[PDB]
Amino acid sequence: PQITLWKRPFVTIKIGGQLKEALLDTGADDTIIEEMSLPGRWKPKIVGGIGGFIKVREYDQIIIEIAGHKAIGTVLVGPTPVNVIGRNLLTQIGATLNF
Amino acid sequence: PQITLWKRPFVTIKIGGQLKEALLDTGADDTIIEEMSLPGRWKPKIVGGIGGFIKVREYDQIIIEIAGHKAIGTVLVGPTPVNVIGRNLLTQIGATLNF
Ligand SMILES: COc1cccc2cc(C(=O)N[C@H](C(=O)N[C@@H](Cc3ccccc3)[C@H](O)C(=O)N3CSC(C)(C)[C@H]3C(=O)NCc3c(C)cccc3C)[C@H]3CCOC3)oc12
User: Fold this and answer.
1) Is residue A25 within 8 Å of residue A84, measured between CB atoms?
2) Which end of chain A has fewer beta carbons closer than 10 Å to its terminal beta carbon, N or C?
3) How many other C-beta atoms lie within 10 A of the C-beta of residue A42?
């Protein structure tokens, strides 16, 4: 699709068998989701931005369907105020910024 | 242009006659730049990112060029880790997300 930016670009994602709303975020290196269960090993990570840093769990090789497009990559789980789809998965669904 | 997301989407901006690097950030409502001198009066704003909230200075009707595209709009100044071009100016230069 072509998504304009008059409002926050939220889409529906499917992850870990759950449906969630998440923000298509070109300023995010990584993908971070609110607290949820994911399968496999995880490692601790600290990520930061406006306001400071937060502690998350890093899960690798996770599949997320993003607005109907499947991908696989790392997903961070932690106290993010908003679910965010970052560049690591945006590249995989073929997303670009155009002007 | 068409900007891919394999690396951080930095572009060169011009503001106050000076060239700076700034991140094109669809996850940001607003545009926020590192401490610099801007003309006119400012108003207080609180913005909230991944790690909490921060206090910034809001300057209105600021002349800014984004990858050669001329814009005039609201610019926030505050302790941002990097310069961020948010949706208020992305919309003005006609940027969309496409996949
Ligand atoms: C409490 O906070 C909020 C609550 C509810 C809604 C919103 C919306 C916004 C918003 O747009 N916030 C902007 C923002 O910081 N947005 C960020 C995303 C976000 C959106 C909503 C809530 C929280 C974060 C930005 O797009 C980004 O990824 N930034 C801005 S600063 C940055 C370039 C380093 C990067 C970053 O945070 N990276 C951290 C990060 C993430 C998110 C994922 C994976 C790895 C890392 C390191 C600021 C910046 C200028 O306008 C206001 O905040 C909210």
Assistant:
1) yes
2) N
3) 15
Could you give the domains of chain B?
1-99 (2.40.70.10)
**Annotated catalytic sites of A, by residue?**
25
Sign of CA dihedral A53, B7, A40, A66: positive
Distance from the alpha carbon of residue A16 to the mean position of ligand 1, in angstroms: 23
Q: Do A98 and B98 touch (CB under 8 A)?
A: yes
Amino acid code (one letter) for A86: G
* Ligand 1 contact via A50 beta carbon (within 6 Å): yes
The coordinates were experimentally obtained by: X-ray
**A-chain residues within 8 Å CB-CB of B5?**
26, 87, 90-91, 95-97
Rounded distance between C-alpha atoms, residue A85 and residue B94, angstroms: 22
User: Catalytic residue numbers of B?
Assistant: 25
- The C-alpha atoms of residue A25 and residue A82 are separated, in whole angstroms, by 11
| Distance from the alpha carbon of residue B75 to the mean position of ligand 1, in angstroms | 16
Residue with tokens 């607005």: A67
What are B32's strand-pairing partners?
Answer: B76, B84
Resolution of the experimentally solved model in angstroms = 1.5
